[PDB]
Amino acid sequence: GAPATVTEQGEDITSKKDRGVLKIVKRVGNGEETPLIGDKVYVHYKGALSNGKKEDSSHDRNEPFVFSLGKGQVIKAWDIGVATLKKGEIAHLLIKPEYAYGSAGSLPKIPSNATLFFEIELLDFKGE
Numbered sequence: 798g799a800p801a802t803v804t805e806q807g808e809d810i811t812s813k814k815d816r817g818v819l820k821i822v823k824r825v826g827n828g829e830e831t832p833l834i835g836d837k838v839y840v841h842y843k844g845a846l847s848n849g850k851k852e853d854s855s856h857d858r859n860e861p862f863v864f865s866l867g868k869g870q871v872i873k874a875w876d877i878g879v880a881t882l883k884k885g886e887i888a889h890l891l892i893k894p895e896y897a898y899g900s901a902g903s904l905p906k907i908p909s910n911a912t913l914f915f916e917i918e919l920l921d922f923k924g925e
């Protein structure tokens with residue numbers, strides 16, 4: 798499925814090139830701009846543990862999820878990954894624990910050393 802495609806075909810968007818965050822663009826967005834650190838970003842998403850049937854989704858807020866990019870308001874992989882998206886883009890991200898919750902996890906919801914998968918839509922972003 799979608800995680801396997803990211804493993805085989807996903808681009809490594811980490812600075813260290815350690816495959817900690819792999820990306821596939823699933824729908825191309827508009828324009829050339831991608832958000833800067835400090836910008837307020839608005840997304841829809843769904844997220845899964847790799848090994849589990851439990852899903853989280855912004856569609857249940859029925860509302861955009863909002864955060865300021867590069868301000869440690871989300872896991873590292875999202876500061877890295879969302880920064881690469883254009884407005885209207887939908888991407889898949891496969892995320893190793895070092896760029897999420899690490900060996901600690903976030904118990905009981907997130908286990909130790911969990912890989913995560915997300916589908917993310919960048920709705921909009923605005924300068925601070």
Ligand SMILES: COc1ccc(CC[C@@H](OC(=O)[C@@H]2CCCCN2C(=O)[C@H](c2cc(OC)c(OC)c(OC)c2)C2CCCCC2)c2cccc(OCC(=O)O)c2)cc1OC
Nearest residue numbers: 844845846852853863864869870871872875897898903913
């Ligand atoms: C800088 O590092 C951190 C910053 C923030 C956190 C908290 C979890 C942080 O979660 C995350 O960063 C990632 C990426 C964004 C979407 C949520 N997310 C998650 O892992 C999800 C998540 C994790 C959560 O807590 C761990 C959630 O809160 C209970 C949560 O609620 C909607 C959702 C996982 C859920 C299970 C399946 C795998 C996904 C979070 C959760 C909810 C809203 C957030 O920002 C917007 C807002 O506050 O309105 C930020 C952990 C961090 O490190 C582990």
